[PDB]
Design a protein around this nucleic acid. Structure first.
Ligand SMILES: [Mg+2]
Ligand SMILES: [Mg+2]
Ligand SMILES: [Mg+2]
Ligand SMILES: [Mg+2]
Ligand SMILES: [Mg+2]
Ligand SMILES: [Mg+2]
Ligand SMILES: [Mg+2]
Ligand SMILES: [Mg+2]
Ligand SMILES: [Mg+2]
Ligand SMILES: [Mg+2]
Ligand SMILES: [Mg+2]
Ligand SMILES: [Mg+2]
Ligand SMILES: [Mg+2]
Ligand SMILES: [Mg+2]
Ligand SMILES: [Mg+2]
Ligand SMILES: [Mg+2]
Ligand SMILES: [Mg+2]
Ligand SMILES: [Mg+2]
Ligand SMILES: [Mg+2]
Lengths: 218, 88, 129
RNA sequence: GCAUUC
RNA sequence: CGUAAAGCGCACGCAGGCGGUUUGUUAAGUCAGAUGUGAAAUCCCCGGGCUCAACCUGGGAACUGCAUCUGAUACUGGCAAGCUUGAGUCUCGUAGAGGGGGGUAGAAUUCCAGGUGUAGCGGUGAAAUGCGUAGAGAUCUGGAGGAAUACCGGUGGCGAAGGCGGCCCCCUGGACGAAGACUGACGCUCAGGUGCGAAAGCGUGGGGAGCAAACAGGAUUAGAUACCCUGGUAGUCCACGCCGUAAACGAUGUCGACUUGGAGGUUGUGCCCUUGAGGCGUGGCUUCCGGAGCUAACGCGUUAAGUCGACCGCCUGGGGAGUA
């Protein structure tokens, strides 16, 4: 529901003209979002997300900025949904079949560590090869068990994650995004105007969807 | 261009009163006064081409106004040219 | 200088539709109102209004369907430099009848279909699809 | 510093 | 028709083309119907006849035209009366290398005269021609004359374009803003025409410091009618006339309307005002980057090369040739 924070936007210099409808005014030289318009669209976002959630669909969280990199992972632990916390590899969805073998390599790396077959005297097995696990995990950690294209895309920034939006649009996957004043609309089917980088803003966002998904999943 | 006192004198002479400045008679009379006044200027400064271009605009503007007045009312046009002693 | 006010009315509609503008306002005239009335009847424009007496201003309420402009295309046909008149049998039909052509007949301004039904020709104003 | 041609 | 061929160098403008808005009238254009005519054949449509076809033939349609008659009045035009939003005049201000004329100032170069002073100076990649013991260069004093205006100076300003930089005066053009008043379509464009139009060049008469085609010498080089060096005439400057050409370029004609934005420069103006080398608005001009759209692409992008209207100019493979 409506509460403190989130309303804060960015400077009027970097505003996107396409977002004129969702700006309430230029307060202290920085645009502030119209909350009365955000709640209807936002409430629609959870309702749509709940509907697909009841269909056992797979939701994907896309957060790359350091401010929310750990936040998305926390939601991915509160619910069984998938996420991307670090750089979005170009083509994670367009050529998913190409990325499948990369996931399989991570599984093999994970296995070799579990049963201790990697504890060979050589540093090559001990150090060089095991350093690939965290390199792959930090980028493919939350997508390991997706097993296919997501049924919906959730994005914290529509411009910082413009690559992810393009892939989802190409594949026809519905896109939900926390679109900011400076961000580019028309690439997201469901737009949630508001702040994208404030810590207290995102946590409410991914926290809200992380909840309604659980009720929809049942 | 033209002194305010001289401009006021022409307005009251040709127009209905001191406030009727838009009348074709006032506009034509004002242009004629400046054109005649500038005759001495170009007698001495023969190659003041840049200012002469402005003078030709007044001549062209006066001709357009005179033709409009002639079309609108011939009788008024005939009286005006007689008073100003032009169209020779 | 402005020499074809009708083209300005059509241009404003075309530019406004491309800009996703809710409505377009322009100086009003009897011919513009007559053309606007035909557009409103055919469903191309939601509504139109005239405000002011000394300097009336004509406002047109544009309409959109599925987020795209209803008026796919609108072009002036008869122009001050070249005016076009058509007989009853020569009345054109836009997009094989899906569109309409606004015709200024002796009985007023009406679509090509109306003029054809009435059996009266006249000046072709514009094609709007 | 100058330094052509196939 | 920015770069592929193609926007006159830029303007003013007659003929011509086009023209805001309201009422009445006219019914020329336009539109409807009828009448006369539009020969026959031919073409076309439905039939008939040569064994079929070609071919022949009946009727219709067609001959998109012209003329008259009767009507229609929306649009265009004519006529009459209007209206203010286009355009224009007036009042108060602002900025500017806008133009013409006259005067004047300082720095510097060259030259002339004199003093001090002594063997180099000048120049190049190197060198030489050249200047100098007849006293150069350097340095100081005074005088003469010409040309251009350091700093300010800034993708700053002004002008139709070309173009216009010290300062002062005289004459003078245009632009822009503030409200208010006035005229009431007087407008836009423009073949021909006319005016202006860098530099070089030409004519006459002056002037001539610097610079410098031509020319001369010294170098360079296989040669060097060049680049480099030392000299140097026309010219560059002024007066008046002529020439009318430039990559005269934004390689982008003029006018008007419409269409998301961001950051600057410049010049007016409104308002909040004690919490000023402040806060929010509204005009003119102008630079840069970019959205839609557009474009062959590059790119353009509210100052369009986007979306439209009016008028003019111009292009139709290369070369020959903008030549005979
Ligand atoms: Mg070329
Ligand atoms: Mg070319
Ligand atoms: Mg008219
Ligand atoms: Mg008639
Ligand atoms: Mg016949
Ligand atoms: Mg037969
Ligand atoms: Mg009329
Ligand atoms: Mg001409
Ligand atoms: Mg010269
Ligand atoms: Mg000479
Ligand atoms: Mg001489
Ligand atoms: Mg030389
Ligand atoms: Mg030429
Ligand atoms: Mg030039
Ligand atoms: Mg050219
Ligand atoms: Mg040009
Ligand atoms: Mg003109
Ligand atoms: Mg741009
Ligand atoms: Mg020749």
């Amino acid at each position: 529901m409506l509460k403190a924070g989130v309303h804060f936007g960015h400077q009027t210099r970097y505003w996107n003209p396409k977002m004129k409808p969702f700006i309430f005014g230029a307060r202290n030289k920085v645009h502030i979002i119209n909350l009365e318009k955000t709640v209807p669209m936002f409430n629609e976002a959870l309702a749509e997300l709940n509907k697909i959630a009841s269909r056992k669909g797979k939701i994907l969280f896309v957060g790359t900025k350091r401010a929310a990199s750990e936040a998305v992972k926390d939601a991915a632990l509160s619910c069984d949904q998938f996420f991307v916390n670090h750089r979005w590899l170009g083509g994670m969805l367009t050529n998913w079949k190409t990325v499948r073998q990369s996931i399989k390599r991570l599984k093999d790396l994970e296995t070799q560590s579990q049963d201790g077959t990697f504890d060979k005297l050589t540093k090559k097995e001990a150090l060089m090869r095991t350093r690939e696990l965290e390199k792959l995990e930090n980028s493919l950690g939350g997508i390991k068990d997706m097993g296919g294209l997501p049924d919906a895309l959730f994005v914290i920034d529509a411009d910082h994650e413009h690559i992810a939006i393009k892939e989802a649009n190409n594949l026809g996957i519905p896109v939900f995004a926390i679109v900011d004043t400076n961000s580019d609309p028309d690439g997201v089917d469901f737009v949630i105007p508001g702040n994208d980088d404030a810590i207290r803003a995102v946590t409410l966002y991914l926290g809200a969807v992380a909840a309604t998904v659980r009720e929809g999943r049942s | 261009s033209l002194s305010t006192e001289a401009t006021a004198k022409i307005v009251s002479e040709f127009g209905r009163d001191a406030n009727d400045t838009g009348s074709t008679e006032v506009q034509v009379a004002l242009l004629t006064a400046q054109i005649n006044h500038l005759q001495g200027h170009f007698a001495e400064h023969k190659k003041d081409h840049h200012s002469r271009r402005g003078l030709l605009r007044m001549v062209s503007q006066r001709r357009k106004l005179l033709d409009y007045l002639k079309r609108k009312d011939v009788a008024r046009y005939t009286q005006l040219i007689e008073r100003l002693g032009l169209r020779r | 200088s402005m020499q074809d006010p009708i083209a300005d009315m059509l241009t404003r509609i075309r530019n406004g539709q491309a800009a996703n503008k809710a409505a377009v306002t322009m100086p009003s005239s009897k011919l513009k109102v007559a053309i606007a009335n035909v557009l409103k009847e055919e469903g191309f424009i939601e509504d139109f209004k005239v405000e002011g007496d000394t300097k009336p201003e004509l406002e047109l309420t544009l309409k959109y369907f599925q987020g795209k402009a209803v008026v796919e295309s609108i072009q002036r046909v008869s122009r001050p430099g070249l005016r076009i008149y058509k007989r009853k049998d020569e009345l054109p039909k836009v997009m094989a009848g899906l569109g309409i052509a606004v015709v200024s007949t002796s009985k007023g301004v009406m679509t090509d279909r109306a003029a054809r039904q009435a059996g009266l020709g006249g000046e072709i104003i514009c094609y709007v699809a």
